[PDB]
């Protein structure tokens, strides 16, 4: 006996239903109102009593007539998962939008799920090499980890992620999930083409990647449950198929934003800045539904659009809490032109310990950090009084630091086109060696511009020859 | 125009019908709104402040607001278990922990 | 005469009304009305008041419906009978909007008769799917040096134009429309763009000057102007970009390439702010609505280059942001930046210091704009963007002992800066840009002292045409340099440089 | 649920009242007794508005209630419980509000659909009848649900008439047509 | 030419005020009564057409 | 060691470090991970305190790390606002000082 | 506000006897010219000069609308305007005065501008 109801209110995309039957679908149940445009999926979010629930509406509202029939789908939206998800781009409702036709469902699982137990957790520590110079030296990634970017310009964020996909996911052989929450349709199309081109998606062939894509035009409520869907697909691989996976999530600021949008309408008096007074709990659940359990290792990559680049804003702040390593990307380093735009004084990783990457690696990094910090420190003095009129000891430091800053550059392979420079990918072992030498001033005797926008030490030597001509 | 939490129509109609509950206004009470993990239950007038209240779902929740008719019981669990019109029976104990 | 027009109008009122739905207004003011009845209303419908004003229902509440007045309060009076238009907000779309100024309702404010329009189409629509997108490859030529190669733009491409308030922001876009005069006076329909200039939050006088400018440059016949002046009601202004984009989609859905310039979305933000506050919804971040991101994203992502299967059309989008205090950090600017791909930040200091237009290249980026490029202007212009962001660095620490390597770069950089400069309302041929860039890249502008670089440029162009317009004709058809063209350019450039 | 949920605060009382007397039947009786005590309440000047207005306690209000049930001993008991409710909720300014609403629900239950034919002037009885006939024979009131229709005179409307009921109106007045005509020749 | 166009506008507002004068005449007449009868029979036809 | 608002993985690493130094042989870890309910998070410092008092009661000496009280405050902010608890407090409700002080 | 059609399609430079004005920032029809600087530089005299210029230049009118005008200054302006004869009893009166007052309610401060605009 399907629970029938009427649409009491349509205040924005937070429709309210009044079930006529005494049967009441519980919180996080899902309802389908059969739309003359298709269907609208709504999800029960409050019971306000007098048989009036208040429901989040996951598809674009309009043409709603107050009184329209409701039907209870029951429970959270249950997507269909399987190996058959691989090679599909699926909508929030899980229906293939790349028109691969309906998935041959194996197990269909509710989007919401409880986060794995403390007991379930197992702590990994394996290095995951990136091949990006700055990443390798300053903040070595680990396999199974939760990796983080805190970019302000999505133009840079997407490139960074693309590079990571290009390097890591070809090396990786296990399943991989790309979930793009609220990102540009054109960019999404680029990825789809690119992935198909690099065979990771081979539609005629087989795909070891699955895709969930959420466009930023999609209504806020839809964007809210794009994430949960992706986590379910990931969970199916991690748990049910047991396979070691990968996961990319970008832009997870949009998850936060969507919540902030709905919050007012839901009837919650907003917390500071504007972020929902439920921010910590909502974020918490999401980031604890991404885990490396003892049944699988899911390396996750999260991209945060820091709004106004203010890290001090609470929403970026609460993101910082649940990440193993972060590599904040900022506008200043972008202005300096250095791609990658990673701040070298604002990166950290749990794996930066010398017990992990060895004392020699740690020592090399230590010197880089200290030198750059000095360089940042003398920026005031440099402007007020000539750099010439600085101490002899300091001038060596300044010259070294100017070189180090330039050295940190490395053309990307994916954006070899965009940079217009053929990409550079350099070994981690090579990187440590190269920086060690530079710190010992071995190659300090050749142009500063020779270190600029180029890769490895050997390349610098060659670029000296080029410059010399 | 005033809107009182006792103007809930099921309560209100019961009062008009004369006959109304008691004891579900002592040791029991019926949920009437619940969402955001924050319930508001009608009843429980023997509740002491900070007490732990057993939702019939099985959720345990302390009570942090004793309002002029609806006790606001903060759930310790997800509200996807709790649902409207449930009975909650007062644990009768303010929270306590084993120490050793 | 006047009598005949009056007679036409009296004859033009016919038939007595047939209505069977109404509501009656409760409390009205604040540009929101609360109506009693209309229980059969559709959501986001257009309703017509007895005052004759029309509004869009936003809040359907169990006892009241809250219309939003697209118009002025003075018109409306309490307890008036509102009858449902019966249609979700739609605006006439069609071919005959071509060469017409219109307001956002679609009422022709140029008043060049009633609009000839194929259809009307709903204001809000979902953007084309992933599968309906084919990656860009056809460029739009702007005829402005740096724009047309250092920050190149595609077709269907979404790239920001951001910068300082009233730096004649508008002019950059006008020049694009002008450059595409011979493209749009072209007979190749693929080369035809149909450009919509949305003027939001602008003085009606200023818009009229723009219209007159466009009609002076006889560009009106290929362009539509949508106008939403400052005087026009704040909700109407809110609905103005969305409506304009619908018109663009009709062109797009003819599979015909187009462009829409939304000048200025910053005024849409203020408008939406007003609406939100008057809807008494809590202020978002920086006191701009919390759904402001959604407002922009739903608007912006409608621009697309349709997939070959599903047409071929495009609707290029350049949205013009009025940066308050010229600081790009700020909620409204950053939100736009994240949506757009590429930016065209403009620097005021440089603008004052005679780079017209002054395209800051530190804060101008272009990502997928450089996937639609003329291969000739890709070959000649390779990495010049990097070079002039080395010039930026070099002069950073120039203001000191300058190594000969840096000094050479500075000398080139400064000379290149002279080359960059353009003269407003003078668009340049793509073909003509190819030799000029070759010269500078190959450092032949060492050969002309900085002061006389401008003289060289014009003279060089005259030289090139006279010496051999064959090269330019070749670049006109081939559009990709060959070894012969490359050599011819080396030879020609050295020859002119000498004289 | 009640015939026509008007919603609204004070109509939560009406809704409650309606369903409470609906399940025990005798809604007409309740309504009639409520009307009768309401009418003599308005026709009693102290406690006609000069003791319907708040300034009284719960206890002082209660003694006002006791006087009210002296005024017509035996109402219908549900409405005597309603008086208790009103005392306890300490509302009595929205007493006539509830009365009107209970009437709307009641005569909706009866199916007596009262309408209105606002006009500029008092209309012919032939006009009344012809419109009533037409309206009964229309889709709008198909009949099955009784039709009451009231012509009212409003000076503001200048000529014509507007028929209204069910949120479905035919507005065929003169004033509006003149307005539109004027407007179109001001263009 | 400018005055010619101006004269067309001036004529339009003059004849507009003549229309207002006609309105004042119309609402006076027991055409006001007879056209109410016209509205009445029309409304009967409309409402019967439903 | 009281851990409020922290992910299970962080806590798990801590216990691994502690087990490595064999110091879990004298430590108690009271945890309320980010996932765990906001009421449970609010209750977590005060019940950790109670555990501490048992040491005090025995006359023994002990040390309690309250990491982060800031996350308790956020939890109490969300709790208070969800309670309809009236003051914003600059985004943290009035009486947060009373909570921390006690 | 006047219609799109009623907007004039060109802005002609309004002449002012002051050469400095006509050189470095030419005034024009329908123009909004935003004064900057502080009173006592001769703000009032500059404004007065413009009235004189307007009378010769066009023979137009002016209306000095003062939004929340300081009443001390208002006395002065009336006296000065009388003295410079731009207002003269039975004599010529070009400028019409609407003076705002900060003692008048905020609402009346809002409406002074609209009153001036109508005139």
Tell me the number of helical segments of chain D per DSSP (H or I, 4 or more residues long): 7
Beta-strand proportion of chain D: 5-15%
Kindly provide the name of the CATH class of the largest domain in chain A.
Answer: Alpha Beta
- The beta-strand count of chain D equals 4
* End-to-end C-alpha gap of chain A: 84 Å
Radius of gyration of chain D: 21 Å
Tell how many strands the DSSP assignment of chain A holds.
18
Structural category of chain A = alpha/beta
Strand order of the largest sheet of chain D: 2-1-3-4
Q: In the CATH hierarchy, what is the architecture of the largest domain in chain A at level 2?
A: 3-Layer(aba) Sandwich
Would you identify the CATH H-level superfamily of the largest domain in chain A?
Answer: P-loop containing nucleotide triphosphate hydrolases
In the CATH scheme, the class of the domain at 11-110 in chain D would be Mainly Alpha
**Count of domain modules of chain A:** 3
Could you tell me the CATH topology label of the domain at 11-110 in chain D.
Peroxidase, domain 1
CATH architecture of the domain at 11-110 in chain D: Orthogonal Bundle
The dominant shape of chain A is elongated
Greatest interface (CB-CB under 8 A), with counts per chain:
A-C, 69 and 72 residues
PDB class: hydrolase
Keywords: ATP Synthase, hydrolase
Entry title: Yeast ATP synthase State 3binding(b) with 10 mM ATP backbone model
Chains A, G: ATP synthase subunit beta
Tell me what you see in this structure.
The structure is cut from a larger assembly and holds 2 copies of chain A, 3 copies of chain B, 1 copy of chain D (187 residues) and 1 copy of chain E (50 residues). Chain A has 469 residues and is α/β, with parallel strands linked by helices. Chain A folds into 3 domains: 1-76, Thrombin, subunit H; 77-351, 3-Layer(aba) Sandwich (Rossmann fold), CATH 3.40.50; 352-469, Bovine Mitochondrial F1-ATPase, ATP Synthase Beta Chain, Chain D, domain3 (Orthogonal Bundle). Chain A contains 16 helices and 18 strands. The radius of gyration of chain A is 25 Å and the shape is elongated. With 100 residues, chain B is mainly β. In chain B, a hairpin with a 3-residue loop joins strand 4 (60-66) and strand 5. Chain D has a domain at 11-110: Peroxidase, domain 1 (Orthogonal Bundle), CATH 1.10.520.20. In chain D, a hairpin with a 2-residue loop joins strand 3 and strand 4 (168-173). Chain D is elongated and about 65 Å long. Chain D starts with 10 loop residues before the first helix and ends with a helix. The PDB classes it as hydrolase.
């Amino acid at each position: 006996t399907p629970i029938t109801g009427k649409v009491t209110a349509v205040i924005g995309a937070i429709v309210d239903v009044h079930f006529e039957q005494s049967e009441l679908p519980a919180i996080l149940n899902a309802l389908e109102i059969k739309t003359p445009q298709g269907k609208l999926v709504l999800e029960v979010a409050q019971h306000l009593g007098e048989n009036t629930v208040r429901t989040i509406a996951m598809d674009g509202t309009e043409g709603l007539v107050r009184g329209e029939k409701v039907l209870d789908t029951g429970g959270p939206i249950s997507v269909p998962v399987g190996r058959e998800t691989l090679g599909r781009i699926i909508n929030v409702i899980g229906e293939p939008i790349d028109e691969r036709g309906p998935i041959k469902s194996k197990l269909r699982k509710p989007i919401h799920a409880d986060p794995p137990s403390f007991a379930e957790q197992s702590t990994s520590a394996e290095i995951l090499e990136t091949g990006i110079k700055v990443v390798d030296l300053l903040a070595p990634y680990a396999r199974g980890g939760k990796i983080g970017l805190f970019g302000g310009a999505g133009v840079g964020k997407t490139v960074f992620i693309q590079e990571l996909i290009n390097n890591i996911a070809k090396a990786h052989g296990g399943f991989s999930v790309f979930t793009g929450v609220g990102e540009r349709t054109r960019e999404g199309n680029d990825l789809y083409r690119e992935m198909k081109e690099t065979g990771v998606i081979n539609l005629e062939g087989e795909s070891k990647v699955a895709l969930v894509f959420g466009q930023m035009n999609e209504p806020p409520g839809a964007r809210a449950r794009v994430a949960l869907t992706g986590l379910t697909i990931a969970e199916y691989f991690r748990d049910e198929e047991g396979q070691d996976v990968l996961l990319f999530i970008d832009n997870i600021f949009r998850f936060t934003q969507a919540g902030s949008e709905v919050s007012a309408l839901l009837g919650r008096i907003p917390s500071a800045v504007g972020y929902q007074p439920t921010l910590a709990t909502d974020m918490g659940l999401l980031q604890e539904r991404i885990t490396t359990t003892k049944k699988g290792s899911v390396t996750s990559v999260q991209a945060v659009y820091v709004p106004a680049d203010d890290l001090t804003d609470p929403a970026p702040a609460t993101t910082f809490a649940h990440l193993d390593a972060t590599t904040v990307l900022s506008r200043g380093i972008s202005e300096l032109g250095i791609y990658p735009a990673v701040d070298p004084l604002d990166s950290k990783s749990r794996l930066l310990d010398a017990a992990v990457v060895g004392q020699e690696h740690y020592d090399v990094a230590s010197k880089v950090q200290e030198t750059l910090q000095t360089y940042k420190s003398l920026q005031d003095i440099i402007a007020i009084l000539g750099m010439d009129e600085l101490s002899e000891q300091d001038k060596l430091t300044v010259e070294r630091a100017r070189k180090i800053q330039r050295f940190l550059s490395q053309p990307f392979a994916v954006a070899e086109v965009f940079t217009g420079i053929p990409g550079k990918l350099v070994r981690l072992k090579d990187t440590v060696a190269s920086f060690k030498a530079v710190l010992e001033g071995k190659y300090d005797n050749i142009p500063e511009h020779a270190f600029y926008m180029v890769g490895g030490i050997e390349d610098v030597v060659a670029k000296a020859e080029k410059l010399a001509a | 125009t005033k809107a009182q939490p006792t103007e809930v129509s099921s309560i209100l109609e019961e009062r008009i019908k004369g006959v109304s509950d008691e004891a579900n206004l002592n040791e029991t009470g019926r949920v009437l709104a619940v969402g955001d993990g924050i319930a508001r239950v009608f009843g429980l007038n023997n509740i002491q402040a900070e007490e732990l209240v057993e939702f019939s779902s099985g959720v345990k929740g302390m009570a942090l607001n004793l309002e002029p008719g609806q006790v606001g019981i903060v759930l310790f669990g997800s509200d996807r278990l709790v649902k409207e019109g449930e009975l909650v029976k007062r644990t009768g104990n303010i929270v306590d922990v084993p120490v050793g | 005469e006047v009598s005949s027009i009056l007679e036409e109008r009296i004859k033009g009122v016919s038939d007595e009304a047939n209505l069977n739905e109404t509501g009656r207004v409760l409390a009205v003011g604040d540009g929101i009305a609360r109506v009693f009845g209309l229980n059969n209303i559709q959501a986001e419908e257009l309703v017509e008041f007895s005052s004759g004003v029309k509004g869009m229902a936003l809040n359907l509440e169990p006892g009241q419906v809250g219309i939003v007045l697209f118009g002025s309060d003075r018109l409306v009076k309490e307890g008036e009978l509102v009858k449902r238009t019966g249609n979700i907000v739609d605006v006439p779309v069609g071919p005959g909007l071509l060469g017409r100024v219109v307001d956002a309702l679609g009422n022709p404010i140029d008043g060049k008769g009633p609009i000839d329009a194929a259809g009307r189409s709903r204001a809000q629509v979902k953007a084309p799917g992933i599968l309906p997108r084919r990656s860009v490859h056809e460029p739009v030529q702007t005829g402005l040096k740096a724009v047309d190669a250092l920050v190149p733009i595609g077709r269907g491409q979404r790239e920001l134009i951001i910068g300082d308030r009233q730096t004649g922001k508008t002019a950059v876009a006008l020049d694009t429309i002008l450059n595409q005069k011979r493209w749009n006076n072209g007979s190749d329909e693929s080369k035809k763009l149909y450009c919509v200039y949305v003027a939001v939050g602008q003085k009606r006088s200023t818009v009229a000057q723009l219209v007159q400018t466009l009609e002076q440059h006889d560009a009106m016949k290929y362009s539509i102007i949508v106008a939403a002046t400052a005087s026009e009601a704040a909700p109407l202004q809110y609905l103005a970009p969305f409506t304009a984009a619908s018109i663009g989609e009709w062109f797009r859905d003819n599979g015909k390439h187009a462009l829409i310039v939304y000048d200025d979305l910053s005024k849409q933000a203020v408008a939406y702010r007003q609406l939100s506050l008057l809807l008494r919804r809590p202020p978002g971040r920086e006191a701009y609505p919390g759904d402001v991101f959604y407002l922009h994203s739903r608007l912006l992502e409608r621009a697309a280059k349709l997939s070959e299967k599903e047409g071929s059309g495009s609707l290029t989008a350049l949205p013009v942001i009025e940066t308050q205090g010229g600081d790009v950090s700020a909620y409204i600017p950053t939100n736009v930046i994240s949506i757009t791909d590429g930016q065209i930040f403009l620097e005021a200091e440089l603008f004052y210091k005679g780079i017209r237009p002054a395209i800051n290249v530190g804060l101008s980026v272009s990502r997928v704009g450089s996937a639609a490029q003329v291969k000739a202007l890709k070959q000649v212009a390779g990495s010049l963007k990097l070079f002039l962001a080395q010039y930026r660095e070099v002069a950073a620490f120039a203001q000191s002992d300058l190594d000969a390597s840096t000094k050479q770069t500075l000398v080139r950089g400064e000379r290149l800066t002279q080359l960059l400069k353009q003269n407003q309302y003078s668009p340049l041929a793509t073909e003509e840009q190819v030799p000029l860039i070759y010269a500078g890249v190959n450092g032949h502008l060492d050969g002309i002292e900085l002061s006389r670089i401008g003289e060289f440029e014009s003279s060089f162009l005259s030289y090139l045409k006279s010496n051999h317009n064959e090269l330019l004709t070749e670049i006109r058809e081939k559009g990709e340099l060959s070894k012969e063209l490359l050599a011819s350019l080396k030879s020609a450039t050295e020859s002119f440089v000498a004289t | 649920p009640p015939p026509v949920r008007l919603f609204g605060v004070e109509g939560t009382y009406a809704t409650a009242l309606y369903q409470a007397a609906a399940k025990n039947s005798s809604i007409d009786a309740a309504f009639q007794s409520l009307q009768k005590v309401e009418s003599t309440v308005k026709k009693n000047p102290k406690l006609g508005h000069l003791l319907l207005n708040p300034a009284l306690s719960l206890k002082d209000r209660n003694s006002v209630i006791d006087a009210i049930v002296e005024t017509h001993k035996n109402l219908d008991g549900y409405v005597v419980n309603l008086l208790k409710v009103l005392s306890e909720n300490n509302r009595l300014g929205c007493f006539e509000k509830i009365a009107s609403d209970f009437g709307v629900l009641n005569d909706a239950h009866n199916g007596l659909l009262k309408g209105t034919v606002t006009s500029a002037e008092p209309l012919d009885p032939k006009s009344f009848k012809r419109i009533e006939k037409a309206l009964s024979a229309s889709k709008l009131v198909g009949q099955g649900k009784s039709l009451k229709l009231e012509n009212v005179v409003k000076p503001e409307i200048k000529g014509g008439l507007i028929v209204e009921l069910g949120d479905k109106t035919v507005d065929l007045s003169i004033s509006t047509k003149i307005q539109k005509l004027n407007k179109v020749l001001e263009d | 030419v400018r005055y010619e166009a101006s004269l067309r506008q001036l004529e339009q507002r003059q004849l507009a005020k003549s229309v207002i004068s006609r309105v004042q005449s119309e609402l006076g007449n027991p055409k006001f009564q007879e056209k109410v009868l016209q509205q009445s029979i029309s409304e009967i036809e409309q409402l019967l057409s439903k």
